[PDB]
Design a protein around this ligand. Sequence first.
Ligand SMILES: Nc1ncnc2c1ncn2[C@@H]1O[C@H](COP(=O)(O)OP(=O)(O)O)[C@@H](O)[C@H]1O
Ligand SMILES: Nc1ncnc2c1ncn2[C@@H]1O[C@H](COP(=O)(O)OP(=O)(O)O)[C@@H](O)[C@H]1O
Ligand SMILES: OC[C@H]1O[C@H](O)[C@H](O)[C@@H]1O
Ligand SMILES: OC[C@H]1O[C@H](O)[C@H](O)[C@@H]1O
Lengths: 306, 306
Amino acid sequence: AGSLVVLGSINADHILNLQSFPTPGETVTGNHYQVAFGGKGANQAVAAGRSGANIAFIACTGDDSIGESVRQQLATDNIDITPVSVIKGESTGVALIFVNGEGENVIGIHAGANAALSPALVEAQRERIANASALLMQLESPLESVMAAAKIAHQNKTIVALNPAPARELPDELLALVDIITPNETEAEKLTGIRVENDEDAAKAAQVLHEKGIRTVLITLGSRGVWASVNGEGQRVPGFRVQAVDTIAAGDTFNGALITALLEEKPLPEAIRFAHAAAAIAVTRKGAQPSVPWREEIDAFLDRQR
Amino acid sequence: AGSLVVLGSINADHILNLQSFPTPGETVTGNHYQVAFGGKGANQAVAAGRSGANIAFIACTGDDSIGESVRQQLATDNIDITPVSVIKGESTGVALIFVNGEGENVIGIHAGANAALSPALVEAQRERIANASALLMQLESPLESVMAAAKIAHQNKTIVALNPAPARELPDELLALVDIITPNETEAEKLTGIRVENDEDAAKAAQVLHEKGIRTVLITLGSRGVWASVNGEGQRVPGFRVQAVDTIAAGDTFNGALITALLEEKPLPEAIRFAHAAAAIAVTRKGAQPSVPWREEIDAFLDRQR
Ligand SMILES: Nc1ncnc2c1ncn2[C@@H]1O[C@H](COP(=O)(O)OP(=O)(O)O)[C@@H](O)[C@H]1O
Ligand SMILES: Nc1ncnc2c1ncn2[C@@H]1O[C@H](COP(=O)(O)OP(=O)(O)O)[C@@H](O)[C@H]1O
Ligand SMILES: OC[C@H]1O[C@H](O)[C@H](O)[C@@H]1O
Ligand SMILES: OC[C@H]1O[C@H](O)[C@H](O)[C@@H]1O
């Protein structure tokens, strides 16, 4: 397989399980409480490393205690943490997360040291990005750095995979550099203006994105799987039917495992099925980063799928 | 003034300011992030101590770092922290809080060591409660302990003040022991079944509570002040018109300062105005516990109010 570079956030997730999300001005008594490592960057780097990728992660942590402990944890997930920088005088990004009784979540993040991953730190990784087969990024890192890295990858024929989360509009300059884009329905709408509630709307939104220069458009549809579209031709690839207990990190798992399968030269439909299997396991498990499956578990799940 | 005992929670508040609260399955990027001491118990103990009460606080913290630092902080707010116990092997209660652009908040709590404040630890404070002039409690401590303390106070002619927050139904056995109850509109509805949207509904809900044995019923009405009712006769006491920037801890400030004025023998209407002044300052300031005003500030605010 070729080599993967993930560039993105690292957060300290503070997660409280409760029955129902609190409404304005209300206090709700929750149950289980956990502090764990997270961040869309780190979650996708862990999904790639645990599923078998050859992956290195460009990220910034603070030098608070959790910042000084997270690189050691990530190295054990088969991630080359050489390009994870520790920013002195700053604290690691934070997420405050509520998970309801049905397994849905709401997340509020604070950038912290993730905001120090700058164009200059990207430029210091130019050779690493140029030599990689693929670059996977999200939108929890400064837009300027995402753009700087997409440009380096574009110049060197490094595949640019962008999971455009959390949702925001992006400049056409950045969208023209992306090879693979993986919005959920909300993100697809934010990027194109087309609400996606069915496969017909998914093809409409996909076409706008293809019109921006993006060849492979994968619009994730929750329990309905994904609308896969390559330069206009699209199809729905259903996910696996499982009993969801906590949907957090589903998307992150899908992305990291998706790129691992593509870098092993599995064709797109098969890579999507591999990623659907990894994400299906993840939604049957509690927590975000801890819920990401290992390669042997993903294969065992696929092997049982007849 | 007589002596006050506050019995209630201590939490580590993690507060993220954002523009709008996240909806289900969404991630929202916030701005300012702070960790500060909080808890309805500690916030009311601080509001009482800073406004001039002679107050002691019965509470339980964990022996995590924040637990071992919070008693020292609370002692500086003129609070006798002798009855704050440190529970080995447990972590301090936690709150995860989002504050929106308009200054509204949503809170999710995890009990942690607050759940160790038991009937046996209450019973160990029997003389302290019996000797106090008033006992102020909230519903972030085990119901059984609230009940044990209300009983001791009741037996010794110690005024029982209960701020029934967060909202839940309470047994008639407990309501019969309360002398002063201070629900907000949501809590009044939860306790009586009567939605409170005006002064007519407030009198209806107040009457149910008087019918439960509670002589003084104060139903807080947000920016509309409070419906004050003593054994049936009620009136609205408006609050002060201010520019709210963060409404968190408004209720807590109102309660602690309310009891301070009552223990200085100010009649009820004047005590409510003093408390309205303290809470009005608090809503013009960011954060929960840090927003609670000191006696000199409250008086200066009242002195300017002509
Ligand atoms: N309820 C579910 N059951 C099984 N797989 C699911 C379920 N929900 C999501 N998935 C998996 O996670 C992927 C992403 O889900 P989606 O909700 O659209 O993304 P996100 O979590 O990024 O918002 C899906 O394409 C699928 O692989
Ligand atoms: N917008 C406001 N402006 C001024 N005072 C306010 C405002 N909102 C609340 N208060 C003060 O806080 C007290 C409690 O407010 P309320 O919203 O009813 O309680 P809680 O925060 O416990 O839900 C009020 O009675 C008043 O003293
Ligand atoms: O996608 C899940 C992640 O979103 C936010 O980044 C949290 O850190 C969490 O780990
Ligand atoms: O009333 C504000 C308080 O409610 C919750 O207890 C939080 O800890 C916060 O300090």
